[PDB]
Curated annotation (Swiss-Prot):
Protein family membership: Belongs to the peptidase A1 family.
Reactions accelerated catalytically: Hydrolysis of proteins with specificity similar to that of pepsin A, prefers hydrophobic residues at P1 and P1', but does not cleave 14-Ala-|-Leu-15 in the B chain of insulin or Z-Glu-Tyr. Clots milk
Name by which UniProt lists this protein: Endothiapepsin
Encoding gene, per UniProt annotation: EAPA
Record's keyword terms, sorted: Aspartyl protease, Disulfide bond, Hydrolase, Protease, Signal, Zymogen
Disulphide-bonded residues: C255-C290
NAD as UniProt keyword: no
Highest taxon of the lineage: Eukaryota
Residues the record marks as active site: D35, S199
C-alpha cells in the first residue's frame, strides 16, 4: 500500500504545517501537525477541558463505531518549547492520504497547555519519530508509520515541505518526479529515539564550505534551524545589522538587510537553504526588526534540522531494518 497527503502551512511564515487525517468510522477529519521529532498521535477531543478548546476540530470517540477504549492507558508529553498535553487512549482506524491503519492508538487529550489552545489551526500531532519515545503507559504504543510499515510497498515515508506553499507527505514510495539530481543517504542513530544524523559541514552564502561534523535531528515539528553557536554566529556576521537579542530570545535583523543562503552537507552532497527561507518577519506588528530562522541550539542539548532546513530538500525517512535518511535538492 501507499499513502499521499498534502501538508499546508498554518500561516504566511510557515510556522508549522498541517495535514488532514481521517480518524474513526464515519471519518472525523482533523488537521494534525506531522512531527518527526515525537512519537505520540494525540488529538483535541470531546474529552478536552472545555476552557482549553478554542476553535480546534475535536475527535469524539463515542461517535466512532470502531473506537475502543485502551483500558487503563494514559499519556503525558512535554515538548522542547515547554508546551504539553495529556489524557487517555483509544484505538481506532486512522487514514492518511489513502493509507489506512486499523487499531492505531489515538491519544485523546484531557488537558493541553496554552500554546496549543491558542493555535486554532492545529487539532493535534501525529508523531513520526521512533516508537521508543511514545509516552503511553503502561503499554507503549506504536506510531502510525510503525503500524503501517509492513503493509507499505517500501518501508519509507518522505517529507516534501513547501516554502510559503503546500507540500507533500508520502508513505510507502519515493516520488522520483519530486526532486532533482540524486538522493544522498546518510546514517541514522536511533539511540535517542530521533531521526538523528551527522551533517558534514556548512557554508554561508557564497563562502567556502567548512567541513565539520554536526550531529542533529531531522524534525518536521520544529520550525527553525538550530545549530551550534559558532555556526550561527558565522551566519549572522554576514548580515548587516544583525544581532542576538536576549529580550527577543535570539538573532534578529533589519528587514532592509539581504539574507545569504545557508548550505549544509549531506555526505559529499549539499543542500542550499535560500536566504528568504531564513526570514520569519517582524518580531511584532510594525517592527523593523525581523526574526531569524537560524538560531543557536546552545542549551537545547541537540542540534535541530527543523522546517527551515528540511523545506529546502526532498527528505526520505527510511525505516528499513537499519534506518537511514535521504536528502535531495528540489
Amino acid at each position: 500500500s501507499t499513502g499521499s497527503a498534502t501538508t499546508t502551512p498554518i500561516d504566511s511564515l510557515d510556522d508549522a504545517y498541517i495535514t488532514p487525517v481521517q480518524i474513526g468510522t464515519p471519518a472525523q477529519t482533523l488537521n494534525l501537525d506531522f512531527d518527526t521529532g515525537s512519537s505520540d498521535l494525540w488529538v483535541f477531543s470531546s474529552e478536552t477541558t472545555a476552557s482549553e478548546v478554542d476553535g480546534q476540530t475535536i475527535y469524539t470517540p463515542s461517535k466512532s463505531t470502531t473506537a475502543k477504549l485502551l483500558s487503563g492507558a494514559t499519556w503525558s508529553i512535554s515538548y522542547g518549547d515547554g508546551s504539553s498535553s495529556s489524557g487517555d487512549v483509544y484505538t481506532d482506524t486512522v487514514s492518511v492520504g489513502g493509507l489506512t491503519v486499523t487499531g492505531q492508538a489515538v491519544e485523546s487529550a484531557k488537558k493541553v497547555s496554552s500554546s496549543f489552545t491558542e493555535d486554532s489551526t492545529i487539532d493535534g500531532l501525529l508523531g513520526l519519530a521512533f516508537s521508543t519515545l511514545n509516552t503511553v503507559s503502561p503499554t507503549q504504543q506504536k506510531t502510525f508509520f510503525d503500524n503501517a510499515k509492513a503493509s507499505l510497498d517500501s518501508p519509507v515515508f518522505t517529507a516534501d515541505l513547501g516554502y510559503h506553499a503546500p507540500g507533500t507527505y508520502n508513505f510507502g514510495f519515493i516520488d522520483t518526479t519530486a526532486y532533482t539530481g540524486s538522493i544522498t543517504y546518510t546514517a541514522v542513530s536511533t539511540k535517542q529515539g530521533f531521526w538523528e544524523w551527522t551533517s558534514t559541514g556548512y557554508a554561508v552564502g557564497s563562502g567556502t564550505f567548512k567541513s565539520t561534523s554536526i550531529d542533529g535531528i531531522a524534525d518536521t515539528g520544529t520550525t527553525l534551524l538550530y545549530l551550534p553557536a559558532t555556526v550561527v554566529s558565522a551566519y549572522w556576521a554576514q548580515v548587516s545589522g544583525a544581532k542576538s537579542s536576549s529580550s527577543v530570545g535570539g538573532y534578529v535583523f533589519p528587514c532592509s538587510a539581504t539574507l545569504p543562503s545557508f548550505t549544509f552537507g549531506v555526505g559529499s552532497a549539499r543542500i542550499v537553504i535560500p536566504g528568504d527561507y531564513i526570514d520569519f518577519g517582524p518580531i511584532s506588528t510594525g517592527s523593523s526588526s525581523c526574526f531569524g530562522g537560524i538560531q543557536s541550539s546552545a542549551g537545547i542539548g541537540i542540534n535541530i534540522f527543523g522546517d527551515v532546513a528540511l523545506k529546502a530538500a526532498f527528505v526520505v525517512f527510511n525505516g528499513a531494518t537499519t534506518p537511514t535518511l535521504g536528502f535531495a535538492s528540489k
